[PDB]
Design a protein around this motif. Structure first.
Motif, PDB file in Angstrom:
ATOM      1  N   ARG A  54     -67.716   0.392  45.870  1.00  0.00           N
ATOM      2  CA  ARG A  54     -68.493   1.594  46.093  1.00  0.00           C
ATOM      3  C   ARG A  54     -69.304   1.445  47.360  1.00  0.00           C
ATOM      4  O   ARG A  54     -69.726   0.337  47.705  1.00  0.00           O
ATOM      5  CB  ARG A  54     -69.440   1.851  44.921  1.00  0.00           C
ATOM      6  N   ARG A  55     -69.523   2.571  48.038  1.00  0.00           N
ATOM      7  CA  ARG A  55     -70.558   2.655  49.069  1.00  0.00           C
ATOM      8  C   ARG A  55     -71.924   2.365  48.460  1.00  0.00           C
ATOM      9  O   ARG A  55     -72.298   2.896  47.399  1.00  0.00           O
ATOM     10  CB  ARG A  55     -70.580   4.019  49.745  1.00  0.00           C
ATOM     11  N   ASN A  56     -72.644   1.498  49.151  1.00  0.00           N
ATOM     12  CA  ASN A  56     -74.016   1.156  48.845  1.00  0.00           C
ATOM     13  C   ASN A  56     -74.964   2.297  49.224  1.00  0.00           C
ATOM     14  O   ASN A  56     -75.266   2.506  50.396  1.00  0.00           O
ATOM     15  CB  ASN A  56     -74.357  -0.128  49.617  1.00  0.00           C
ATOM     16  N   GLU A  57     -75.443   3.024  48.216  1.00  0.00           N
ATOM     17  CA  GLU A  57     -76.390   4.132  48.386  1.00  0.00           C
ATOM     18  C   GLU A  57     -77.565   3.893  47.412  1.00  0.00           C
ATOM     19  O   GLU A  57     -77.472   3.020  46.539  1.00  0.00           O
ATOM     20  CB  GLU A  57     -75.693   5.470  48.075  1.00  0.00           C
ATOM     21  N   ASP A  58     -78.675   4.610  47.563  1.00  0.00           N
ATOM     22  CA  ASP A  58     -79.808   4.368  46.658  1.00  0.00           C
ATOM     23  C   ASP A  58     -79.366   4.572  45.222  1.00  0.00           C
ATOM     24  O   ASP A  58     -78.652   5.522  44.919  1.00  0.00           O
ATOM     25  CB  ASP A  58     -81.095   5.159  46.995  1.00  0.00           C
ATOM     26  N   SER A  59     -79.769   3.667  44.347  1.00  0.00           N
ATOM     27  CA  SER A  59     -79.383   3.791  42.953  1.00  0.00           C
ATOM     28  C   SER A  59     -80.342   3.041  42.061  1.00  0.00           C
ATOM     29  O   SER A  59     -81.099   2.162  42.526  1.00  0.00           O
ATOM     30  CB  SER A  59     -77.956   3.290  42.757  1.00  0.00           C
ATOM     31  N   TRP A  60     -80.309   3.370  40.778  1.00  0.00           N
ATOM     32  CA  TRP A  60     -81.073   2.628  39.824  1.00  0.00           C
ATOM     33  C   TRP A  60     -80.142   2.104  38.748  1.00  0.00           C
ATOM     34  O   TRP A  60     -79.241   2.813  38.300  1.00  0.00           O
ATOM     35  CB  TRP A  60     -82.099   3.512  39.124  1.00  0.00           C
ATOM     36  N   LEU A  61     -80.401   0.879  38.310  1.00  0.00           N
ATOM     37  CA  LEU A  61     -79.742   0.330  37.143  1.00  0.00           C
ATOM     38  C   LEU A  61     -80.676   0.473  35.961  1.00  0.00           C
ATOM     39  O   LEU A  61     -81.814  -0.024  35.987  1.00  0.00           O
ATOM     40  CB  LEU A  61     -79.381  -1.129  37.386  1.00  0.00           C
ATOM     41  N   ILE A  62     -80.172   1.113  34.901  1.00  0.00           N
ATOM     42  CA  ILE A  62     -80.972   1.549  33.742  1.00  0.00           C
ATOM     43  C   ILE A  62     -80.346   1.111  32.408  1.00  0.00           C
ATOM     44  O   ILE A  62     -79.136   1.148  32.275  1.00  0.00           O
ATOM     45  CB  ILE A  62     -81.138   3.105  33.784  1.00  0.00           C
ATOM     46  N   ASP A  63     -81.179   0.699  31.446  1.00  0.00           N
ATOM     47  CA  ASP A  63     -80.751   0.317  30.093  1.00  0.00           C
ATOM     48  C   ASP A  63     -80.322   1.575  29.340  1.00  0.00           C
ATOM     49  O   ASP A  63     -81.015   2.578  29.379  1.00  0.00           O
ATOM     50  CB  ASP A  63     -81.912  -0.384  29.368  1.00  0.00           C
ATOM     51  N   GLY A  64     -79.186   1.514  28.643  1.00  0.00           N
ATOM     52  CA  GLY A  64     -78.663   2.692  27.928  1.00  0.00           C
ATOM     53  C   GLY A  64     -79.619   3.163  26.834  1.00  0.00           C
ATOM     54  O   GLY A  64     -79.583   4.316  26.416  1.00  0.00           O
ATOM     55  N   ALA A  65     -80.507   2.280  26.418  1.00  0.00           N
ATOM     56  CA  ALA A  65     -81.409   2.549  25.308  1.00  0.00           C
ATOM     57  C   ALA A  65     -82.726   3.198  25.766  1.00  0.00           C
ATOM     58  O   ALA A  65     -83.604   3.446  24.937  1.00  0.00           O
ATOM     59  CB  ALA A  65     -81.714   1.249  24.554  1.00  0.00           C
ATOM     60  N   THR A  66     -82.873   3.439  27.062  1.00  0.00           N
ATOM     61  CA  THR A  66     -84.062   4.103  27.588  1.00  0.00           C
ATOM     62  C   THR A  66     -84.152   5.496  26.998  1.00  0.00           C
ATOM     63  O   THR A  66     -83.182   6.213  27.016  1.00  0.00           O
ATOM     64  CB  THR A  66     -83.990   4.243  29.106  1.00  0.00           C
ATOM     65  N   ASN A 100     -71.735  -3.450  21.722  1.00  0.00           N
ATOM     66  CA  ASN A 100     -72.093  -3.040  20.385  1.00  0.00           C
ATOM     67  C   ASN A 100     -71.881  -1.542  20.217  1.00  0.00           C
ATOM     68  O   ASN A 100     -72.658  -0.858  19.553  1.00  0.00           O
ATOM     69  CB  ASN A 100     -73.522  -3.488  20.051  1.00  0.00           C
ATOM     70  N   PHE A 101     -70.818  -1.055  20.864  1.00  0.00           N
ATOM     71  CA  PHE A 101     -70.375   0.347  20.794  1.00  0.00           C
ATOM     72  C   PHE A 101     -71.346   1.394  21.354  1.00  0.00           C
ATOM     73  O   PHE A 101     -71.306   2.562  20.979  1.00  0.00           O
ATOM     74  CB  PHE A 101     -69.842   0.654  19.382  1.00  0.00           C
ATOM     75  N   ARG A 102     -72.191   0.937  22.277  1.00  0.00           N
ATOM     76  CA  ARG A 102     -73.155   1.766  22.973  1.00  0.00           C
ATOM     77  C   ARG A 102     -73.066   1.483  24.448  1.00  0.00           C
ATOM     78  O   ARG A 102     -72.558   0.417  24.854  1.00  0.00           O
ATOM     79  CB  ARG A 102     -74.577   1.422  22.505  1.00  0.00           C
ATOM     80  N   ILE A 103     -73.606   2.407  25.243  1.00  0.00           N
ATOM     81  CA  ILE A 103     -73.782   2.207  26.669  1.00  0.00           C
ATOM     82  C   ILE A 103     -74.967   1.264  26.799  1.00  0.00           C
ATOM     83  O   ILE A 103     -76.082   1.565  26.346  1.00  0.00           O
ATOM     84  CB  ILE A 103     -73.996   3.555  27.431  1.00  0.00           C
ATOM     85  N   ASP A 104     -74.698   0.085  27.339  1.00  0.00           N
ATOM     86  CA  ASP A 104     -75.685  -0.988  27.466  1.00  0.00           C
ATOM     87  C   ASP A 104     -76.466  -0.808  28.794  1.00  0.00           C
ATOM     88  O   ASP A 104     -77.716  -0.772  28.802  1.00  0.00           O
ATOM     89  CB  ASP A 104     -74.926  -2.325  27.387  1.00  0.00           C
ATOM     90  N   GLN A 105     -75.720  -0.692  29.890  1.00  0.00           N
ATOM     91  CA  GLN A 105     -76.300  -0.421  31.221  1.00  0.00           C
ATOM     92  C   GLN A 105     -75.573   0.678  31.955  1.00  0.00           C
ATOM     93  O   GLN A 105     -74.354   0.771  31.884  1.00  0.00           O
ATOM     94  CB  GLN A 105     -76.261  -1.661  32.096  1.00  0.00           C
ATOM     95  N   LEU A 106     -76.328   1.475  32.708  1.00  0.00           N
ATOM     96  CA  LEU A 106     -75.771   2.504  33.549  1.00  0.00           C
ATOM     97  C   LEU A 106     -76.425   2.477  34.936  1.00  0.00           C
ATOM     98  O   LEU A 106     -77.492   1.902  35.124  1.00  0.00           O
ATOM     99  CB  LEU A 106     -75.994   3.880  32.922  1.00  0.00           C
ATOM    100  N   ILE A 166     -71.360   4.492  33.682  1.00  0.00           N
ATOM    101  CA  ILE A 166     -71.430   3.337  32.745  1.00  0.00           C
ATOM    102  C   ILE A 166     -71.119   2.001  33.445  1.00  0.00           C
ATOM    103  O   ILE A 166     -70.050   1.825  34.043  1.00  0.00           O
ATOM    104  CB  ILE A 166     -70.485   3.493  31.518  1.00  0.00           C
ATOM    105  N   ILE A 167     -72.058   1.058  33.394  1.00  0.00           N
ATOM    106  CA  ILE A 167     -71.794  -0.252  33.977  1.00  0.00           C
ATOM    107  C   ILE A 167     -71.133  -1.152  32.935  1.00  0.00           C
ATOM    108  O   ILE A 167     -70.146  -1.846  33.214  1.00  0.00           O
ATOM    109  CB  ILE A 167     -73.074  -0.880  34.632  1.00  0.00           C
TER     110      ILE A 167
END
Ligand SMILES: [Ca+2]
Ligand SMILES: [Mg+2]
Lengths: 84, 77
Positions: free
Chosen positions: A4-16, A71-77, A66-67
């Motif tokens: 991927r092109r490196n652009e501004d982004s955030w890595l976020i916990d799926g449980a937020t 456990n059948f959930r989105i862990d990181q995005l 989705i990163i």
């Protein structure tokens, strides 16, 4: 996907909490029913299909990718500005 | 600032994208995940990191016994 092109982004916990993410991203139009308490829960709804890494949802100004699942959930995005 | 990359990305591709012209190799085809596992020596766990050239390479996910996703950032040491 290719690199991927490196652009501004955030890595976020799926449980937020969903509202916390919407607030931080200045999204004022979103589901208020609370059926999906978390960002990953809402992403799974929008995907409809079983989630897997690289799947993404376009919502408001943003692409939510989705990163990993665990456990059948989105862990990181990752969130970035959408490019369409 | 910080860049998210797949562990399976060919090593040479990531190195060149980062302007790293001097890097370790052997006679085997290598990936960024593979290189990181060589540099770590220990079995890979989320949060483990490698420092090389100007950069920190942090494990974001392991999947299937390989480093699946990593984050690149500038080192601070
Ligand atoms: Ca947030
Ligand atoms: Mg994993």
């Amino acid at each position: 996907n290719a690199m991927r092109r490196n652009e501004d982004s955030w890595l976020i916990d799926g449980a937020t909490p969903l509202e916390d993410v919407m607030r931080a991203l200045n999204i004022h139009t979103f589901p208020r029913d609370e059926n999906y308490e978390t960002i990953g829960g809402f992403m799974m709804y929008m995907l409809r299909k079983i989630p897997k890494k690289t799947d993404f949802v376009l919502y408001d100004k943003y692409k939510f990718e989705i990163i990993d699942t665990e456990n059948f959930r989105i862990d990181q995005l990752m969130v970035s500005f959408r490019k369409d």
